[PDB]
Symmetry: C2
Subunit: 235 residues, 2 copies
């Protein structure tokens, strides 16, 4: 009863952590992903075989059916994976396509959901990429896709973008997150530079409940950890 929030990508490591955290803190949580999270109060099913507009329609219809006359306090989008390759790579385009579908499609639909269901003064959070702040010749598609998300962020923060009054959009860019996969493939790394998922969940709850604790709307927030201490620096 503390409120409602949408987690787009609730099946992932960070997404599941965020969903669990808000639930523990009294919020009703709606998950939007390729499969259901049996811990969520509501599950919106995404069909990966459908195109962009088909996905938008289905996700919007399902979310509206679930919310009825309620609005949400926040929409958190953390969906998407990775695929690299330079222009000379055999799969340069193939992977570029996958990256648009994974980062751009989701971010845009999350934004559409916010213009429709986010309460005035609410929070929309998107996921960018620290690497996209500069050239990315070894992973051009990923770079392009994320740069589009960064631009989307700037357009949404601007006047008459469609977001509700007094709301804010924040885009996170963590350098290294502590996940099961990172522990497996880099088993001997120094975790003193790894950002705990709880650092993110905690900040999302803070920004959701206290508007005065928020960085400027449209901020691209680079998150780093050194000597066990995490820091958020607007770029």
């Amino acid at each position: 009863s503390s409120g409602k929030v949408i987690v787009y990508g609730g099946k992932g490591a960070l997404g599941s952590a965020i969903l669990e955290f808000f639930k523990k803190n009294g919020y009703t949580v709606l998950n939007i992903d390729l499969s259901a999270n049996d811990q969520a109060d509501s599950n919106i099913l995404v069909d990966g075989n459908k195109n962009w507009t088909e996905q938008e329609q289905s996700i919007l219809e399902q979310t509206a059916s679930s919310l009825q006359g309620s609005q949400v306090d926040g929409v958190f989008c953390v969906a998407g994976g990775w695929a690299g390759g330079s222009a000379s790579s055999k799969d340069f385009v193939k992977n570029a396509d996958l990256m648009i579908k994974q980062s751009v499609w989701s971010s845009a639909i999350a934004a559409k959901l916010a213009t429709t269901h986010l309460k005035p003064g609410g929070l929309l959070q998107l996921t960018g990429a620290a690497a996209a702040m500069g050239p990315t010749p070894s992973m051009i598609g990923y770079g392009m896709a994320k740069a589009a998300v960064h631009h989307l962020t700037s357009s949404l923060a601007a006047k008459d973008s469609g977001l509700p009054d007094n709301s804010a959009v924040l885009t996170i860019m963590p350098v290294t997150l502590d996940t099961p996969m990172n522990r497996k493939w880099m088993p001997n790394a120094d975790h003193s530079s790894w950002t705990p998922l709880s650092f993110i969940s905690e900040h999302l709850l803070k920004w959701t409940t206290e508007t005065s604790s928020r960085p400027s709307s449209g901020a691209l927030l680079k998150i780093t950890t050194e000597n066990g201490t995490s820091t958020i620096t607007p770029q």
Copy 2:
């Protein structure tokens, strides 16, 4: 027989002007577009209903059959149209989809054509968007797509991107071009602030034949005209 160049978007106002100017200067020109330009030496037709990878394979195979192991002196991409809308617009996603396909898909395939056929020291030219240098709340999809093209430019210019040795990539951003459509919809505008298509065609030929006349590789070139004089300003 001055050489060979590829014009992706040869049916457009600017694309046709470029094609005509290079043909007039002794070049063999290959056109890539939705329909054929009867003045081109070769025509590569694209099916807009095919997906990104299908389009890539189709364009690459047709171009290779037309070149037969030969290289090109330049690849010029000016394809793409426009669709607007803020995030609250009914067609926000629909148009974002159209804009990614029109600007991003084409720019990436043009880049692929360059890694495969552009001569060392050759030129790859892409088309960005001056408006995308800042927030675009009234045309979010267009802004996202063009921002991706701007980032793609920075990645391609970097070492090991896949482009040939000593080649350069330049991306143009004209504020206003003198086209038939602009003359029709803005009939009483002052043309002293309109950039003549010839200005662009002339610079492409110069940059193609004289490497020392080129701005830095990776440059985003804003083009403005005032009192009849045109100026190129790197961002």
